[PDB]
């Protein structure tokens, strides 16, 4: 979890600040055991109003 923070924070400022998600259960998944790519297609999902 700490090295996908360090990863994003690299690219997509906006991104960062978006990172501080209300709900664990978003973050839950990674424990659970997924990719990065994986996750984040699915937050991009979000900002995919914008």
Same mark, same amino acid.
């Given at each position: 979890?700490?090295? /996908? /923070? !360090?990863?994003? #924070?690299?690219?997509? !400022?906006? #991104?960062? =600040?978006?990172?501080?998600?209300? %709900? &664990?259960? %978003?973050?839950?998944? #990674?424990?659970? &055991?997924?990719?990065? $790519?994986?996750?984040? $297609?699915?937050?991009? =999902?979000?900002? &995919?109003?914008?």
């Amino acid at each position: 979890m700490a090295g /996908l /923070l !360090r990863f994003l #924070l690299s690219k997509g !400022r906006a #991104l960062y =600040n978006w990172a501080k998600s209300h %709900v &664990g259960k %978003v973050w839950e998944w #990674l424990k659970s &055991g997924a990719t990065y $790519e994986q996750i984040k $297609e699915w937050i991009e =999902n979000a900002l &995919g109003w914008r």
